[PDB]
Amino acid sequence: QWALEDFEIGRPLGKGKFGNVYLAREKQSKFILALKVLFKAQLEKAGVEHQLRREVEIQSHLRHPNILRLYGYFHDATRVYLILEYAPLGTVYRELQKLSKFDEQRTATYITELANALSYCHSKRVIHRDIKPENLLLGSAGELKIADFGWSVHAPSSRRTTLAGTLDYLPPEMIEGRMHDEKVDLWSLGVLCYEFLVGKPPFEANTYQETYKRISRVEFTFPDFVTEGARDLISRLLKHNPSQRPMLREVLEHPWITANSSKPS
């Protein structure tokens, strides 16, 4: 159906391990979108064909205001193209670098929108497993949208693929290679809430080996400016035992969240 000749390519929106994303306009309809380009040679070499298929299958059927939409796909003899919803206000990662830290209002609002999207996902037993600032995009009204479902699966699960980059957002059970479920996204939610308020993840470190150690032993401390409400929520989410981590309904109903968020459930 679709082909490259149907689109006019614009400026680069960003780059990933495989994905090179461009702004694009469909010629006949003038529809503005984002074109995620992946090279087949790199996909085969890394052997992550199954990850790409999962990303397409899972994200294309999901329908939620806080989840980035996937419209379709096509390919030539060298590349695979994903037709994505265009997010005009960029990434949370960029916004965080710009402001260094978020206030309590901005943080609680983001967490609320994340919890809503994750609640929708977990209802279909879909785990994201790769929640981090660079995979969180912003809509025209500044609303948060979860993207990059390349690592997403169905619960329960083990890990078949090699961990590539940072360990900063992964729970102990994932890095130790043990079996895991939906509770891993709530660990990441705690890491995110910390980084939003502080400016850096709680287990950040100089080396892979040491970051591993701090995560497995849950070694983190709060700066003095972190309020008691934020500390309570973060401490509940960052539990070593997955079953002790709260439900998403508990997060959405937390007194600190309800007092500072500007969005409802």
Ligand SMILES: Nc1ncnc2c1ncn2[C@@H]1O[C@H](COP(=O)(O)OP(=O)(O)O)[C@@H](O)[C@H]1O
């Ligand atoms: N729909 C989009 N709108 C705007 N920017 C995007 C969009 N999709 C991706 N990007 C940019 O491209 C980067 C990589 O996209 P992503 O799909 O996460 O690639 P990868 O899966 O290789 O990490 C993101 O960090 C973001 O900055």
Ligand SMILES: Oc1c(F)cc(F)cc1-c1cc[nH]n1
């Ligand atoms: O060609 C593809 C496609 F059309 C859809 C999809 F999800 C994946 C692929 C793919 C993965 C490795 N080679 N090709």
Ligand SMILES: [Cl-]
């Ligand atoms: Cl690629």
Ligand SMILES: [Cl-]
């Ligand atoms: Cl498995």
Ligand SMILES: [Cl-]
């Ligand atoms: Cl895997």
Ligand SMILES: [Mg+2]
């Ligand atoms: Mg990404």
Ligand SMILES: [Mg+2]
């Ligand atoms: Mg990816």
